[PDB]
Amino acid sequence: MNWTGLYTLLSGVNRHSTAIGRVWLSVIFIFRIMVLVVAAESVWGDEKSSFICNTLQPGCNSVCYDQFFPISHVRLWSLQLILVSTPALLVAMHVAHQQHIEKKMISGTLWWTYVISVVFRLLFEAVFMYVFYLLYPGYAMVRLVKCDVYPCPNTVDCFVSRPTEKTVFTVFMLAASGICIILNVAEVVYLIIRAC
Amino acid sequence: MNWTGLYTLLSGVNRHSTAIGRVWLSVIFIFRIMVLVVAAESVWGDEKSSFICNTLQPGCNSVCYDQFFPISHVRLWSLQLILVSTPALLVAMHVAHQQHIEKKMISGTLWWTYVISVVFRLLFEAVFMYVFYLLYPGYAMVRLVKCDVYPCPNTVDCFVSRPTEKTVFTVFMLAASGICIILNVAEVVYLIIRAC
Ligand SMILES: CCCCCCCC/C=C\CCCCCCCC(=O)O[C@@H](COC(=O)CCCCCCCCCCCCCCC)COP(=O)([O-])OCC[N+](C)(C)C
Numbered sequence: 370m371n372w373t374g375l376y377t378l379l380s381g382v383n384r385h386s387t388a389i390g391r392v393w394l395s396v397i398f399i400f401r402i403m404v405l406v407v408a409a410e411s412v413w414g415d416e417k418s419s420f421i422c423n424t425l426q427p428g429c430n431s432v433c434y435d436q437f438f439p440i441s442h443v444r445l446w447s448l449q450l451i452l453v454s455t456p457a458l459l460v461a462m463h464v465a466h467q468q469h470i471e472k473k474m475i476s477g478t479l480w481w482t483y484v485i486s487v488v489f490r491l492l493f494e495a496v497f498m499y500v501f502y503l504l505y506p507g508y509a510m511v512r513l514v515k516c517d518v519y520p521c522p523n524t525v526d527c528f529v530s531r532p533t534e535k536t537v538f539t540v541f542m543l544a545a546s547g548i549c550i551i552l553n554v555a556e557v558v559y560l561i562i563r564a565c
Numbered sequence: 566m567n568w569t570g571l572y573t574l575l576s577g578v579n580r581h582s583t584a585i586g587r588v589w590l591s592v593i594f595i596f597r598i599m600v601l602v603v604a605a606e607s608v609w610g611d612e613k614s615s616f617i618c619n620t621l622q623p624g625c626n627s628v629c630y631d632q633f634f635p636i637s638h639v640r641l642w643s644l645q646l647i648l649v650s651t652p653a654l655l656v657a658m659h660v661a662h663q664q665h666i667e668k669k670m671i672s673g674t675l676w677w678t679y680v681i682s683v684v685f686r687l688l689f690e691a692v693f694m695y696v697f698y699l700l701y702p703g704y705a706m707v708r709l710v711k712c713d714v715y716p717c718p719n720t721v722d723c724f725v726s727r728p729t730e731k732t733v734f735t736v737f738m739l740a741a742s743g744i745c746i747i748l749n750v751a752e753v754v755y756l757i758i759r760a761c
């Protein structure tokens with residue numbers, strides 16, 4: 370493994386991306402992948418097993434955990450990464466297909482599809498940011514929550530596992546997503562300006 | 566303690582009661598008291614502590630026990646004995662009061678009050694028999710009961726303590742109560758016949 374191969378793999382074979390989406394976006398993507406890898410198994414490993422409520426009612430822990438955590442942060446970020454990386458994979462596959470068909474026997478089409486893929490990537494980033502805002506208002510996570518879902522009688526106190534570490538990693542991931550959004554907007558603006 | 570004193574105490578100082586209510590009713594009353602004494606603490610001692618249901622729901626045992634045993638057989642029989650013995654106590658106290666007031670200074674009044682007390686005793690016996698029939702239809706007691714009272718989810722299986730011994734003692738007490746009813750009716754009929 371060399372740098373001239375890793376850089377080519379990350380950037381794809383596309384020849385229209387500038388240094389914003391070729392040197393900086395790949396680094397932020399690697400940063401997000403590494404943070405998700407080092408945080409998924411350890412911090413969020415025992416989010417449900419150590420989630421306890423102050424009650425004797427059977428089945429209250431599971432219903433309260435599902436009520437307060439419809440989908441954990443780790444899985445939300447994994448889905449966000451997959452959806453954000455899908456258009457880049459599509460562009461790389463399209464470039465490879467065009468190269469194959471021209472070998473066995475265009476610039477504007479590649480430029481347009483790259484612009485469309487960057488727009489879709491920005492849209493996915495914004496959609497996942499909005500979903501995270503809807504599900505979990507506020508970056509901070511609290512230690513104690515009040516759960517009144519059936520079958521729990523009245524309201525019970527349930528305790529979250531590692532609120533502070535999860536808050537730190539949430540801040541990191543949200544900052545990375547914001548940087549990605551800014552870089553995508555800058556890339557779109559730069560391409561439009563240079564094309565005109 | 567001699568027999569001529571125990572007999573006088575049981576019969577009271579009333580001079581209108583015949584041999585039915587003076588030799589037989591007192592013996593049946595003693596029999597009921599002895600059976601209740603030997604059965605109350607032992608058979609019904611752990612009726613609630615050993616009453617268990619097949620569920621993890623807290624508080625289901627207590628609500629199911631209260632649902633199926635609104636008032637235990639021992640307490641029902643104790644209340645029945647007290648209420649049945651109340652008119653005899655009233656008659657004895659009235660006889661003592663009349664003796665005291667005649668000493669410090671009638672037969673028809675004593676005859677009428679004795680007849681009324683026997684009628685009230687029969688009425689109390691019948692009322693308690695009907696109450697026992699309403700609360701617990703059938704002499705037999707079952708081992709397993711189906712309880713669907715809140716907070717128990719759906720229907721749970723609850724297990725009664727000593728069904729067979731309680732059935733035996735229920736049969737004994739019901740037979741004694743029936744004998745008491747028959748003797749009271751016979752006493753009333755005999756008094757009415759002899760008075761006319
Ligand atoms: C997302 C998770 C990240 C975790 C943190 C990772 C951080 C650290 C991880 C990785 C850092 C890199 C480690 C190896 C570097 C040596 C490369 C090398 O010598 O290449 C040379 C030889 O090599 C080859 O020909 C084969 C290259 C295999 C490299 C390892 C493959 C993946 C290992 C997966 C491991 C799985 C377990 C990992 C954990 C699950 C290049 O070939 P060459 O013939 O010299 O080139 C031509 C010669 N010429 C130039 C003179 C003309």
Ligand SMILES: CCCCCCCC/C=C\CCCCCCCC(=O)O[C@@H](COC(=O)CCCCCCCCCCCCCCC)COP(=O)([O-])OCC[N+](C)(C)C
Binds near residue numbers: 599602
């Ligand atoms: C409902 C529960 C029932 C349970 C089953 C019971 C079955 C067995 C129970 C009881 C059977 C009787 C036992 C004692 C019998 C002896 C009587 C006697 O000798 O009398 C004589 C003396 O006696 C007295 O002067 C005093 C009498 C006291 C008797 C006991 C009082 C209550 C005990 C309560 C115990 C509490 C513990 C019990 C359990 C909680 C009579 O007096 P006298 O001077 O001879 O008379 C005149 C003389 N002359 C005739 C020559 C002219």
Ligand SMILES: CC(C)CCC[C@@H](C)[C@H]1CC[C@H]2[C@@H]3CC=C4C[C@@H](O)CC[C@]4(C)[C@H]3CC[C@]12C
Binds near residue numbers: 378398454455
């Ligand atoms: C500018 C940034 C966003 C570019 C990022 C490039 C990403 C989307 C590309 C570069 C290399 C790609 C990987 C290359 C090889 C494989 C192995 C295959 O069996 C599953 C997909 C997987 C794991 C690809 C996933 C997408 C991937 C990680």
Ligand SMILES: CC(C)CCC[C@@H](C)[C@H]1CC[C@H]2[C@@H]3CC=C4C[C@@H](O)CC[C@]4(C)[C@H]3CC[C@]12C
Binds near residue numbers: 575591653654
């Ligand atoms: C013909 C049958 C029904 C007659 C039965 C007589 C009954 C009702 C009488 C006879 C002796 C009585 C007892 C004599 C003395 C006492 C002690 C007193 O502190 C409480 C009441 C108590 C315990 C009496 C309760 C009623 C009693 C048991």
